[PDB]
Design a protein around this nucleic acid. Structure first.
Ligand code: ERY
Lengths: 174, 142, 7, 38, 209
RNA sequence: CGAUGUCGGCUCAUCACAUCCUGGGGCUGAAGUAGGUCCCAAGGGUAUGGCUGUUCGCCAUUUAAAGUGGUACGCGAGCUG
RNA sequence: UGCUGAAAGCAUCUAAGCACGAAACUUGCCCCGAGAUGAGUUCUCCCUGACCCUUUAAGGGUCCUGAAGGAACGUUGAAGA
């Protein structure tokens, strides 16, 4: 509603082509597409797409706001792209990167091999610092969630894979 | 006088082909059972099979409203130690698509030998094609 | 002999 | 967590959500106030 | 890959030079000639059909005579099929000897087990014999109780009772091959395979790897 | 009431789940080890003896564990008595 | 347990969408199984004669031929009441 009644300013190499209910976008970083819901209406007046509720359906405004939000961060990803920073707190934890397959050494007994999607690239400046660079926000967020879910943060030492400036509350060991 | 009765040698049966794509399950099944018993013909007889042969194409694409695609459970019992087997609508559509249509129609038919014969009239396929092209199946839309 | 009997 | 028939706001930061058709209470400030089934 | 059909020829033991003795079953694996090849054009599934051995020319009926003389092979006893798992192509009349089992390490042997006849519940289902003394009356190796009472009111299906024991198809899995003789067309496997001596065995490579 | 044979033991079971073990998780006044408590889960498993007619119980010694109930307090045209 | 995400400018595992997640469920292993009357498929083999009658019918009868195969019999079997 308040989200959906605000059009999205689409900048710099827009390529926002429509096919029925499908939105395809080429951009600076790449190309992202999605099939939208059937209760939403998109329109390409005034250089910038506007979202209305389609007739007949009950849930119009929430679907339209969800559509506006996903297309907004989607076209933001095709403009400049999303990044995610993970760090490894804890001794014996190294995170060397081999191309498209991250090889974590979280010290279970064996290495951890992690195949990436076709989109997100990964870089390590130091050995406790993974930086994911990808356009599609859900895929980089999902792969950061998988990499954290290999080994969670510990509430006693702070040991584990964690997000960058996310604060972990460590209870002291009684 | 006596009322008219049909005779099983002179009843003249038609062939129909029904595309079951994108339709509701039980509405289609009710129309199928009505056509199978013969209640659409004027010379209806309750002990003579009057109905027609129906070829139901595309049993894969049948639809169910609500959350029945994941939660309509089919129960059947193997007649054994304590094995009550069960399968939802999704794995029944994937594993054995024609069984959904045949179960829905067989629940709607009379029980007895006449109902089993009028169920043998029904021929359910999951593809778009059938091998019954030698009987000229007319399109029965519903 | 009261073994089968309900006594 | 606490599976209960009565879920209430124990804390200032716990919000009441309805996930998967069940009523749950999430406190982001402490995990002892997490509860279910209300 | 496919299995081969052989014959159970006794049991012996071989002595490894380390000192260990291992019991082997010797399987005479004769030349298996492929009679008919199934493919998914006509049949819907792909397979091969093999035969082995020999039969009397007067003991062969004209149906199986014509079926053998259709494609290149000679009369053996029995016909068997093998299911060709993804990537084998065999011409009819192709002799298949025991070199594929010279490569392999574990094996599955399928045979018809020895028929123990009408057996009781003690022999068939390892039931516990009741008391031999302390009062017992005509009920030493009887099966006990077979059901509860009025509430089921019936015996359950699959209740273990007496009946035919033996004489059925049994597969034994993961038997180690210890030696393959190609000039004798023999196969030594470790352990015991189902059947009497001289019974026909089916030898497939192991699936539970 | 012109008859529906009891308690216990033996033999054979079968189901429920309100789970004893195994398996999966949340919280912990959870450092680890080991627990407590709650949620999911019924595939498989789930002692031997002494005493007692005993079920039960106590006890000795194990076990991963020594589940709780229904089935005419399952089961005598199957046995015992 | 999550990711993205509004409804509800925030927040939110959820309404749209996406991913994980157990000895339970469906497969994978093994055995039975086309009486699966919805009685399936594949290959091979065997039959290539004349006439009359009547309610000229998916009809009866007569002579001549009995084919593949089967059964019977016998010797029997680590098969079997
Ligand atoms: C030789 C064979 C004899 O039977 C037995 O010895 C058995 C072993 C008795 O049990 C003997 C021994 C014993 C201990 O039961 C085993 C004892 O309790 C009874 C009273 O007598 C029987 C069966 C008794 O029945 C029982 O009578 C009970 C009153 C009720 C019971 N019913 C509820 C189920 C019923 O079956 C009873 C009365 O003798 C049956 C009547 C018909 C007879 O007299 C007949 C002629 C018998 O003598 C007999 C068949 O020749």
């Amino acid at each position: 509603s308040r989200v959906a009644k605000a059009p999205v300013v689409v900048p710099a190499g827009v390529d926002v082509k429509i096919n029925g209910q499908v939105i395809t976008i080429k951009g600076k970083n790449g190309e992202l597409t999605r099939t939208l819901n059937d209760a939403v209406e998109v329109k390409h007046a005034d250089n910038t797409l506007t979202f209305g509720p389609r007739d007949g359906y009950a849930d119009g405004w929430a679907q339209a706001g969800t559509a506006r939000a996903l297309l907004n961060s989607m076209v933001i990803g095709v403009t400049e792209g999303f990044t995610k920073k993970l760090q490894l707190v804890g001794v014996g934890y190294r995170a060397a990167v081999k191309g498209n397959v991250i090889n974590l050494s979280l010290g279970f007994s064996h290495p951890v091999d992690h195949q990436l999607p076709a989109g997100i690239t990964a870089e390590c400046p130091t050995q406790t610092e993974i930086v994911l660079k990808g356009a599609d926000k859900q895929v980089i967020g999902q792969v950061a969630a998988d990499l954290r879910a290999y080994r969670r943060p510990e509430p006693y030492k702070g040991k584990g894979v964690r997000y960058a400036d996310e604060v972990v509350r460590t209870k002291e060991a009684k | 006088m006596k009322t008219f009765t049909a005779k099983p040698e002179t009843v003249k049966r038609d062939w129909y082909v029904v595309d079951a794509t994108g339709k509701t399950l039980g509405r289609l099944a009710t129309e199928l059972a009505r056509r199978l018993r013969g209640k659409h013909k004027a010379e209806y007889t309750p002990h003579v099979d009057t109905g027609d042969y129906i070829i139901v194409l595309n049993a894969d694409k049948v639809a169910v409203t609500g959350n029945k695609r994941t939660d309509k459970v089919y129960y059947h019992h193997t007649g054994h130690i304590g094995g009550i087997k069960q399968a939802t609508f999704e794995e029944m559509i994937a594993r054995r698509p024609e069984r959904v249509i045949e179960i829905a129609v067989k629940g709607m038919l009379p029980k007895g030998p006449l109902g089993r014969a009028m169920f043998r009239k029904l021929k359910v396929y999951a593809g778009n094609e059938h091998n019954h092209a030698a009987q000229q199946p007319q399109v029965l839309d519903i | 002999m009261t073994h089968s009997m309900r006594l | 967590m606490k599976v209960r028939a009565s879920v209430k706001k124990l804390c200032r930061n716990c919000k009441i959500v309805k996930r998967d058709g069940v009523i749950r209470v999430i406190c982001s400030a402490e995990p002892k106030h997490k509860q279910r089934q209300g | 890959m496919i299995g081969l059909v052989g014959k159970k020829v006794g049991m012996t033991r071989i002595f490894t030079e380390d000192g260990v003795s291992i019991p082997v079953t010797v399987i005479e694996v004769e030349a298996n000639r492929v009679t008919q090849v199934k493919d998914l054009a006509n049949d819907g599934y792909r397979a091969i059909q093999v035969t082995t051995g020999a039969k009397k020319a007067n003991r062969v009926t004209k149906p199986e005579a014509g079926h053998f003389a259709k494609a290149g092979v000679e009369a053996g006893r029995g016909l068997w099929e093998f299911r060709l798992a993804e990537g084998e192509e065999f011409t009819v009349g192709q002799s298949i000897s025991v070199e594929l089992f010279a490569d392999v390490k574990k094996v599955d042997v399928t045979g018809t087990s020895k028929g123990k006849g009408f057996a009781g519940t003690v022999k068939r289902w390892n039931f516990r014999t009741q008391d031999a003394t302390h009062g017992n009356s005509l009920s030493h190796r009887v099966p006990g109780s077979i059901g509860q009472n009025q509430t089921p009111g019936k015996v359950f299906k699959g209740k273990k009772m007496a009946g035919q024991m033996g004489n059925e198809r049994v597969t034994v899995q993961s038997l180690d091959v210890v030696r393959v003789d190609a000039e004798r067309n023999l196969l030594l496997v470790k352990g015991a395979v189902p059947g009497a001596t001289g019974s026909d065995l089916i030898v497939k490579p192991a699936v539970k790897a």
